[PDB]
């Protein structure tokens, strides 16, 4: 190309000036590059200074290369080909420069061009890079491998495709030749490259797997950390996808991995420790570790101590050895269950009472990690350990306090199942004290743990409500941002746990002002709305009428957030390159709070909905690609159907075909909420529902006959079928005997409430229309009627009329023989209410 | 029980800090 003296002098001057210590000269050199950056000829100069101008010192050539790199990562679309191709050529021709800094800049450039640009726009990068691998000069081969490694790392899923034409079928078998390479760096590159293609089950590798595994074993003896690390991660990944090939060497592999897990180089050890995590998921786990489990447990427990650096940092963190070890112990406890306890109790004995806080802390962690797997076996020891943990909550080391909060929360079920005065009461008391700890990590540990306890305890925390609130509100004053969010979650769970008991003027008065205060201080773009909003959702449901003085602004903001989100997606959908897509959680949370408002306020939401476009917006949410949006909108639909149907009725003809298309059990909560909604609309429509039954019934019967479908979906499906039958017995009546079995099984287990009442009314009217539909499975109906404790009188006589009716057809003889099959409670219950 | 199925409990557990 064409380097000129004047141009070169100006750019070299500018590069020197960009390296000036003066701050003002920096800002003006920066704006000068801002202007120059869009001119392709300038880029020609930048690479020219990098690769050709030996006269200039290295930081200048490299800075030129890096400025060029930013220009590529921000303007490469606008590069013409003549300059691009000049850069490409000059880079590959300098991949092995004897200067390490220049070599690194050329490398970053190359990879950046393949990333920002296009892999299929540089068709001959990979082939050339591979051949450079064979070169003589060491640095040249190192540089090419470095480039390939980076390319495989970010372009992973693109070489395993037909975008190009299988370069892997050439690259992978070539890498495996360099595991035997004399230099540690190159070995590392080779392994790290291959490793990118294990979980993908990449053909080129899978049909060379034998040679791969062989070369990995040949490397086991290598003491160079980077190669050990990569071999370790090879074996870990291989364990997940090509198990068969490894079984015959499993003993030596476990021996190796157990050795590496104890390596003093923490980075090697972490990759080794992943082996136990993924091994514990394979069904062959018990069999493989029979010779090694006794050693594995203490090694894991020992790796669960905080590292020395973390101890110092936390004195005033992502995946590490300690977290990996704790996760591995958790899963192994779930595999081995009570069989683990003889391995674990001697370590706990020596750890839980130790005088060195780091050791004690690890012990409490261990005790928590195994809680799920070993719960049954640990019960005998909990009357001692729980009081001991409660004492540890006031340990003088913050990190002991916080881990104790968590471990106790892991035994919350057992605590709640015991007499409240022995464990629950003192635990809750010290948990509340902790919540107001001066240490921020303790605060958050305590809040999480208290929330978990709240979830488990429920009604058992009604007598200690005022004291709980006393503490939670005070936290408003002391908590900083990060922990106020956890507090909102704790309040939310409290409101869900205690329901209407929260509705007292004093509680409302202490709770609402700081919630509204933070509501007014956060903007519509702040993600921190999610916990506040979800907290408000729970509070509103609990407060009911008590929420009246607060609803209007809350309602208004929520509808708008749904609106602006929906408007954002539309705008992003039109011009994706200029308008970023919105975060739909704002919409999910806004809908959920509106659901809570409608459930809480009931009828009293009418004025707000009358003045709103909530249903026009709701129509758009119900059709969204995202399941959770639909799930929230069908929930809101059901709540508004109950609260103010007059505003919903106009939309039914549109809404129903959409509800009808969301009866898909693959999406449990969407299918559920649609089903519930359709039952609620049924009750309000009455016989006007007749045209809509065919779009839903066929599916509902299939869903109620589907094996392994959650209890709650089946209960709602049954209720809805009952409700449809109540308003339109003729359309649904006919299929009576295809659903009566599971309908009865499911509904026999729910409490006597309005929904159950309504659904049984439906099944009674339907029996009158198609009684033969019940004859064959009358045992199920008898049981379902016997499930009623306190039925309203009209429902009872309906029952008695069908029962008395049935006995009069099969005769006192078939009746007696049939009712012999009644368990005692059943026979007696129906003579007690129905005199059958 | 019969009624809506919300994900508030699960969102609350998703923001609980992860020890490991």
Numbering used by the authors:
A (entry chain A): 5 to 320, 371 to 890
B (entry chain B): 507 to 526
Quote from the publication.
The nuclear import receptor Karyopherin β2 (Kapβ2, also known as Transportin-1 or TNPO1) imports FUS into the nucleus, where it functions in DNA repair, transcriptional regulation, mRNA and miRNA processing, and in RNA shuttling and stabilization. Kapβ2 imports WT FUS by binding tightly to the FUSPY-NLS (residues 501–526), with a dissociation constant (KD) of ~ 50 nM. However, mutations related to the PY-NLS of FUS (FUSPY-NLS) cause the FUS variants to localize to different extents to the cytoplasm and cause different degrees of disease severity in patients.
Although the FUSPY-NLS peptide carrying the P525L mutation binds Kapβ2 weaker than the WT FUSPY-NLS, it still binds Kapβ2 with substantial affinity (KD 180 nM), which allowed assembly of the Kapβ2·FUS(P525L)PY-NLS complex for structure determination by X-ray crystallography. We solved the crystal structure of the FUS(P525L)PY-NLS in complex with Kapβ2 (dissociation constant, KD = 180 nM) to 2.7 Å resolution, by molecular replacement. Residues 507–526 of the bound FUS(P525L)PY-NLS peptide were modeled. The FUS(P525L)PY-NLS-bound Kapβ2 is almost identical to WT FUSPY-NLS-bound Kapβ2 (root-mean square deviations or rmsd of 0.5 Å for 784 aligned Cα atoms). Epitope-1 (residues 508–511) and epitope-2 (residues 514–522) of FUS(P525L)PY-NLS bind Kapβ2 almost exactly the same as WT PY-NLS. Structural differences are observed only in epitope-3 (residues 525 and 526) where the ALS mutation resides. The P525L mutation changes the structure of the PY-NLS main chain from residues 522–525, which diverged from the peptide main chain of the WT PY-NLS and moved slightly farther away from Kapβ2. The L525 side chain of FUS(P525L)PY-NLS makes fewer contacts with Kapβ2 W460 and I457, and is too far away to interact with the L419 side chain of Kapβ2. There is no observed electron density for the E523 and R524 side chains of FUS(P525L)PY-NLS even though these side chains have well-defined electron density in the Kapβ2-bound WT FUSPY-NLS structure where E523 contacts the karyopherin and R524 participates in intra-peptide interactions. In summary, the P525L mutation caused local structural changes that resulted in fewer contacts with Kapβ2 and in the loss of potentially stabilizing intra-peptide interactions, all contributing to a significant loss of affinity for the importin.
